[PDB]
From a paper:
Strikingly, the SidE- and [name]-type enzymes, two recently identified effector families from the bacterial pathogen [name], can ubiquitinate host substrates through non-canonical mechanisms without engaging any of the conventional ubiquitination machinery. In addition to [name] and MvcA, the same genomic cluster in [name] also encodes a small effector protein, Lpg2149, which has been shown to interact with both enzymes and inhibit their deamidation activities.
There is one [name] and one [name]~Ub in the asymmetric unit, highlighting a 1:1:1 molar ratio of the ternary complex. [name] resembles an overall crab claw architecture, with the Insertion and Catalytic domains forming one half, and the helix-bundle domain (HBD) forming the other. [name] attaches to one side of [name] and form interactions with both Insertion and Catalytic domains. Although the relative orientation between Insertion and Catalytic domains can be dynamic due to the intrinsically flexible linkers connecting them, the binding to [name] may force these two domains to adopt a fixed inter-domain conformation. The electron density clearly shows that an isopeptide bond is formed between the side-chains of [name]-K92 and Ub-Q40, and at the same time the amino group of Ub-Q40 has been removed. Moreover, the deamidase active site of [name] is located right below the isopeptide bond and the catalytic residues, particularly C74 (modeled back from A74), can form extensive interactions with both K92 and Q40. It should be noted that the aa 87–100 region of [name] adopts a relatively compact conformation in previously reported structures (both apo and partner-bound states), which positions K92 within a small α-helix and hinders potential ubiquitination on its side-chain. Through the interactions with [name], this region undergoes considerable changes, disrupting the helix structure and forming a more stretched conformation in which K92 is accessible to both the catalytic pocket of [name] and Q40 of Ub.
Residue numbers in the entry:
A (entry chain D): 1 to 74
B (entry chain B): 3 to 152
C (entry chain A): 8 to 384
């Protein structure tokens, strides 16, 4: 499985995931590629905020689905 | 039929109350708490009494107690429903935190509004551009809604 | 072209230009912001005003506050993309108990330190369960499961890890936990007393087993990131380090510099700063861990309230570091091209005017794209 993680600057990355990987793991996989600690991340999919504890299959993230990596909060 | 941590936490709140804060359990539900927090001095809420409700979810021990203001308050970190951001930054809720930790947090929050981290955007809009008039409004709400309410 | 001139150029440029340091044109900020903000626009009435309301409320031009991002672009300026890519391949060293390896890793060169600090994300909950009802691929992860003949840890990746307890030990613990609300509960409870009964004596004993087993189990999550710049000084005691950071929902690197926390912490001395960085990982008292955490990483001014109350630091911390060399002619070149990009594309008589034009251009791009997505319905 492949998902895309896009950012506000256009930088897009590809992650090799499984439909049963939790949001915490996909965050850690972003940490592998980018060196961003998951505590410094927020992931958005279709406007909805992805929560720790739930899986990709929950929010229904299919192959070639693009996630938005937010790097600025309050 | 209820864990011991909740019982001693309850008792230690009646036996050793937090100054400015009253918390006693509901008559029908040992997990529901009716809270009164006095308006801290040297704050626009001085002389006020603020009613809150604190609920312990069934996963309260591993979860974070849900709190809500009942009294109407002009504060940038309380939405129009009375909800408070139980913020934990770069970490999650751990059982090392207690009810008293939450109660002290609200009390401290009443003394240090954080407009750059808003929950009432129109209120936080005023707290940044016209802080002296936001404080003036908060003092007015304290007299209207937070006096003789208990 | 000095290492201290490099610190003075990036600090002055991040201080004045904010997000424009990253060299992204404002048109792409507005386009990407419009893509992720289209659903926020009211659908009825004057669409010109509905779009305007959303563009006003956008903070796309405000600098990043993810610490990993800040570290990434600090590395991408002082080393270049190729130099930072090569810097990413190196491995982190865990800071020794007294910070020995770090002090021994800073020779008198123009050095950039990158730090990744982790918090210990060990499980806090347990659950009694039968082997018949225990599915590893569905149940809650980062959790302890006490089965009748085995005590087990289900880590964050769904892997099942045995905790080295005999079937007799688990049988005794399984049958001692009888009360229903103690079936799925927490491990380390201050309020349970082993002398009270046999259930809590078992719950406490299980907690001591799990606690001992996981001081050799890797349960770290990356929590914080920052970089430290150590320029070459003409003498050994004039040496000073400059930590660079941003903090999640707290402050940006631009605010870090405006409040001069980089130079405030530099006055701690190299040995003094590392000593506090070392005591952060070896302490076991939450008040000392929080106090140092607040001193080192809290926004300018909030050192005494940053880690109090709800934000008390109850988790063991681990600081990791990696060091590399900085070529001042590379870094200044990388920065002067950013100044070049800024001036030719967003010219103004001062930085204030150049940033206003950048924000304006980003908003007009966001406006023009939003108008095109919403005209079709």
């Amino acid at each position: 499985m492949q998902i895309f993680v896009k950012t506000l600057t256009g930088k897009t990355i590809t992650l090799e995931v499984e439909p049963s990987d939790t949001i915490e793991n996909v965050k850690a996989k972003i940490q592998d590629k980018e060196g961003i600690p998951p505590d410094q991340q927020r992931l958005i999919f279709a406007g909805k905020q992805l929560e720790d504890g739930r899986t990709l299959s929950d929010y229904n993230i299919q192959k070639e689905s693009t996630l938005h990596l937010v790097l600025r909060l309050r | 039929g209820l864990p011991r941590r909740i019982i001693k936490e309850t008792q230690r709140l009646l036996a050793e109350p937090v100054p400015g804060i009253k918390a006693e359990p509901d008559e029908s539900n040992a997990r529901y708490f009716h809270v009164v927090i006095a308006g801290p001095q040297d704050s626009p809420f001085e002389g006020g009494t603020f009613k809150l409700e604190l609920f312990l979810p069934e996963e309260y021990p591993m979860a974070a107690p849900k709190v809500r203001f009942m009294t109407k308050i002009y504060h940038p970190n309380v939405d129009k429903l009375g909800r408070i951001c139980l913020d934990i930054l770069k970490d999650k809720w751990s059982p090392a935190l207690q009810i008293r930790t939450v109660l002290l947090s609200i009390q401290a929050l009443l003394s240090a509004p954080n407009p750059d981290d808003p929950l009432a955007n129109d209120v936080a809009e005023q707290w940044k551009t016209n802080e002296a008039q936001a404080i003036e409004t908060a003092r007015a709400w304290t007299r209207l809604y937070a006096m003789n309410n208990i | 072209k000095t290492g201290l001139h490099v610190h003075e150029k990036i600090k002055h440029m991040v201080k004045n230009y904010g997000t424009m340091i990253t060299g992204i044109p404002a048109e792409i900020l507005g386009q990407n912001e419009a893509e992720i903000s289209v659903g926020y626009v009211k659908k009825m009435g004057n669409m010109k005003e509905n779009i305007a309301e959303v563009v006003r409320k956008s903070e796309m031009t405000q600098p990043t506050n993810s610490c990993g991002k800040a570290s990434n672009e600090v590395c991408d300026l002082l080393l270049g993309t190729e130099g930072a890519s090569e810097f990413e391949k190196s491995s982190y060293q865990v800071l020794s108990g007294d910070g020995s390896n770090l002090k021994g890793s800073l020779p008198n060169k123009n050095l950039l330190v990158r730090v990744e600090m982790d918090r210990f994300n060990a499980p806090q909950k347990y659950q009694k369960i039968k082997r018949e009802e225990f599915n590893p691929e569905t149940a809650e992860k980062n959790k302890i499961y006490l089965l009748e003949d085995q005590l087990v840890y289900l880590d964050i990746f769904g892997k099942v890890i045995d905790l080295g307890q005999t079937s007799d030990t688990c049988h005794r613990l399984f049958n001692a936990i009888t009360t229903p609300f103690y079936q799925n509960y927490i491990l380390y409870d201050e309020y349970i007393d082993p002398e009270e009964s046999a259930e809590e004596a078992a719950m406490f004993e299980m907690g001591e087993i799990v606690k001992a087993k996981m001081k050799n189990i890797d349960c770290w999550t990356a929590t914080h990131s920052f970089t430290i710049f150590v320029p070459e000084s003409d003498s050994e005691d004039t040496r000073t380090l400059y930590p660079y950071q941003a903090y999640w929902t707290s402050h940006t690197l631009q605010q870090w510099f405006s409040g001069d926390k980089d130079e405030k912490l530099s006055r701690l001395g190299i040995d003094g700063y590392i000593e506090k960085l070392a005591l952060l990982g070896t302490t076991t008292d939450s008040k000392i861990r929080s106090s140092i955490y607040g001193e080192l990483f809290s926004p300018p001014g909030k050192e005494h309230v940053f880690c109090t109350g709800m934000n008390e630091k109850f988790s063991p911390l681990r600081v990791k570091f990696k060091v590399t060399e900085v070529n001042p002619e590379i870094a200044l070149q990388n920065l002067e091209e950013v100044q070049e990009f800024i001036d030719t594309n967003y010219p103004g008589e001062n930085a204030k005017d150049q940033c206003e034009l950048y924000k304006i251009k980003a908003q007009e791009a966001m406006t023009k794209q939003l108008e095109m997505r919403l005209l079709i319905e």
